[PDB]
Amino acid sequence: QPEPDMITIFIGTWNMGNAPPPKKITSWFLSKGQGKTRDDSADYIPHDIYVIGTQEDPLSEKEWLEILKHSLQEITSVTFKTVAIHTLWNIRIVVLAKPEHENRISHICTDNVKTGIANTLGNKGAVGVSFMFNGTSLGFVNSHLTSGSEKKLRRNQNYMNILRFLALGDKKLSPFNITHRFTHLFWFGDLNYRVDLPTWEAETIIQKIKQQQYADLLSHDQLLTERREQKVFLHFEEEEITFAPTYRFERLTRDKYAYTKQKATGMKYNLPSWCDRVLWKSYPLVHVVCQSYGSTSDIMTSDHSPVFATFEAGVTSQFVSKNGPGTVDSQGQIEFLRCYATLKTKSQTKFYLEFHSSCLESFVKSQEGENEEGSEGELVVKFGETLPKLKPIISDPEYLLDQHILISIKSSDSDESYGEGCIALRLEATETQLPIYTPLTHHGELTGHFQGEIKLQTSQ
Numbered sequence: 001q002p003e004p005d006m007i008t009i010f011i012g013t014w015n016m017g018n019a020p021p022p023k024k025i026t027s028w029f030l031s032k033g034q035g036k037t038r039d040d041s042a043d044y045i046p047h048d049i050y051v052i053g054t055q056e057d058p059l060s061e062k063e064w065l066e067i068l069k070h071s072l073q074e075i076t077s078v079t080f081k082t083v084a085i086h087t088l089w090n091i092r093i094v095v096l097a098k099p100e101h102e103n104r105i106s107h108i109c110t111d112n113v114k115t116g117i118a119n120t121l122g123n124k125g126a127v128g129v130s131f132m133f134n135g136t137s138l139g140f141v142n143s144h145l146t147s148g149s150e151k152k153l154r155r156n157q158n159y160m161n162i163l164r165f166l167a168l169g170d171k172k173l174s175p176f177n178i179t180h181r182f183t184h185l186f187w188f189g190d191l192n193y194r195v196d197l198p199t200w201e202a203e204t205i206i207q208k209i210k211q212q213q214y215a216d217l218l219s220h221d222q223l224l225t226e227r228r229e230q231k232v233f234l235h236f237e238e239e240e241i242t243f244a245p246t247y248r249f250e251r252l253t254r255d256k257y258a259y260t261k262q263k264a265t266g267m268k269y270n271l272p273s274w275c276d277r278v279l280w281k282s283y284p285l286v287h288v289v290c291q292s293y294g295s296t297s298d299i300m301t302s303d304h305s306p307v308f309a310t311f312e313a314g315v316t317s318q319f320v321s322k323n324g325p326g327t328v329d330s331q332g333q334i335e336f337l338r339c340y341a342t343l344k345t346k347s348q349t350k351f352y353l354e355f356h357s358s359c360l361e362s363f364v365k366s367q368e369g370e371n372e373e374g375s376e377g378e379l380v381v382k383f384g385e386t387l388p389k390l391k392p393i394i395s396d397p398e399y400l401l402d403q404h405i406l407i408s409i410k411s412s413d414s415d416e417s418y419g420e421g422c423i424a425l426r427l428e429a430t431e432t433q434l435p436i437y438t439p440l441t442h443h444g445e446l447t448g449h450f451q452g453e454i455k456l457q458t459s460q
């Protein structure tokens with residue numbers, strides 16, 4: 001049996017509105033309804049991994065696992081294995097995989113983050129799962145962010161607390177948050193961003209939805225506008241939305257949006273909105289292709305419709321040579337020329353780099369760079385030709401060109417990271433000086449840039 005170089009991943013998000021689901025939810029897992037839907041000819045083909053995020057989920061873990069497994073068995077005739085299940089309050093994530101993958105999946109982690117303080121701590125936050133699939137790290141975050149059209153800033157704060165504090169993936173990657181720990185990171189949920197139009201425009205919005213004219217609505221979608229202004233989800237992708245707003249429906253039909261203010265809404269309007277979303281971030285030059293992104297039309301127990309997204313995702317094998325793992329391969333090396341970090345920090349302290357990668361026996365600390373002033377006020381940390389020669393564990397180009405180097409720039413005084421980034425070794429050429437570049441972030445905010453040249457030697 002050859003190891004896969006691609007898998008398909010199903011992501012679902014559903015706010016169940018504290019109601020049990022209907023007896024049939026197969027349309028969700030088949031990516032049928034509105035938007036970018038899956039071809040009928042694929043219906044019996046199982047995805048490799050199914051990741052199900054719920055919010056306002058009234059079921060026990062056992063009740064929901066039985067419904068999910070029985071659903072997938074009906075569709076595919078496959079009995080899926082439970083990889084992980086984690087619940088915080090009424091926020092839940094389930095990971096299911098094809099039985100053939102049981103011995104390809106390892107290092108399973110779960111965690112949660114509770115968002116808000118006192119008033120605002122009690123029901124919002126995130127759950128997450130990570131694991132290795134052979135040589136590829138996968139992370140999954142299901143978040144239920146703050147509700148209400150006038151709380152987009154709170155939602156952005158909730159996002160930053162989740163990416164700082166969710167403890168998934170390799171704990172040896174200590175400088176890096178979840179936005180750098182995974183080959184592929186999927187973040188989904190009831191993110192609760194709204195279409196930010198006047199209340200008086202409610203009936204116009206409904207009209208536009210009935211005409212399937214989403215353009216004038218998406219131009220006011222708070223997640224798209226906040227992402228365009230770099231306020232949230234920096235360096236994440238989302239497929240184009242071609243399905244109707246998934247909130248807020250009258251239950252037991254999809255024919256009516258319930259938007260008017262009620263005691264039960266805290267006298268808030270719920271204009272039709274794309275509350276329920278799937279986003280991703282993969283390391284540079286890894287295969288990831290969205291093959292579906294849409295909402296179901298036939299599941300109506302909740303005031304939200306379920307959302308599905310499916311992906312092709314590149315994966316690598318668990319590589320063994322005569323040498324590494326357990327030693328270096330003298331035939332491999334990674335060199336860096338003309339490198340410098342540009343930092344937004346107003347501070348004047350010395351900096352050094354740390355290089356982290358599963359292609360190294362352990363992380364590598366550089367010497368301090370030389371600080372200079374940029375011509376527009378910036379701090380420029382020059383490394384010139386001073387960065388170490390990195391010694392990978394395996395020199396085979398079929399392995400090494402698929403790897404990535406995480407970079408942190410750290411203060412000498414405090415050893416705190418000021419910026420994190422990632423460089424692909426998927427180069428156009430080996431033994432050749434080539435430009436490299438990554439933005440640097442800290443707590444998911446842009447803090448600088450790292451650029452220079454790389455020269456990669458493989459056994460070929």
Ligand SMILES: CC(=O)N1CCCNCC1
Nearest residue numbers: 044045073074075076077
């Ligand atoms: C061929 C196949 O795998 N299927 C799965 C669903 C059950 N009935 C038949 C079709």
